[PDB]
């Protein structure tokens, strides 16, 4: 009922269970050329 208590209201629950084909994203910075840098191209360091 839309007027009952707070924990007596419908709560939607999604449970994520983990077990290699799903990872988090990889953040790509910028390419700066003509400077001595410390690169990581796709795991090639």
């Amino acid at each position: 009922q839309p007027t009952n208590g707070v924990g007596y209201q419908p709560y939607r629950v999604v449970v994520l269970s983990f077990e290699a084909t799903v990872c988090g994203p990889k953040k790509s910075t910028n390419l700066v050329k003509n400077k001595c840098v410390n690169f990581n191209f796709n795991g090639l360091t």
Partner: antibody
Amino acid sequence: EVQLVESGGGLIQPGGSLRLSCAASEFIVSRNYMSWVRQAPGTGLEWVSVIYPGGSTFYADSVKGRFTISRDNSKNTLYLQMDSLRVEDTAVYYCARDYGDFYFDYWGQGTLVTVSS
Amino acid sequence: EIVMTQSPVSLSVSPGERATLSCRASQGVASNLAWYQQKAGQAPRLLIYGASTRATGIPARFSGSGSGTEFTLTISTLQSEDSAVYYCQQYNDRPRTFGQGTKLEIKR
């Protein structure tokens, strides 16, 4: 035939131990939902414990740690072992069959325990 | 928890007067109430479950209803075997707390 006949009551010292029994009729103790309830004068009717099909033993917060329930599967019996009984534990104990954990469907006749010096 | 309170704690009523008993629930439950009757040295039967349904063999004398914060049981024709203790109990809150008991007797 619905019967819930109880036993195990008697006079014990404060700080002693005893053991209850609730023989059930025509339904299964270990597979149905039932509960141990108490009634003392001056206080209201009070829930003590509830027991599930296999499930879990759920106690009151006042008696948690002190009472234990161990149903014995040889017949339709339900027990409760009472250890470290306090002074306020003079009550008649009832075994009551539940509709899960909603409401008390059926009751016993109760066995009354008096603890005193 | 819901701490129960019966307002008509003791009611002496003529043999058949359509007597009125009540309780209030200190929290908000929609219709989560069951009414109980404990007789003298007997097993306390349920009377009403869900605050609007008569369970098994409970007659049309009992017309208990109510919601939210006020609940009322109506007893109609008052045989002398109804001189008993009337409880009201919620379904919603663990731990379950019973009513304090309504002592109903018939004057002779």
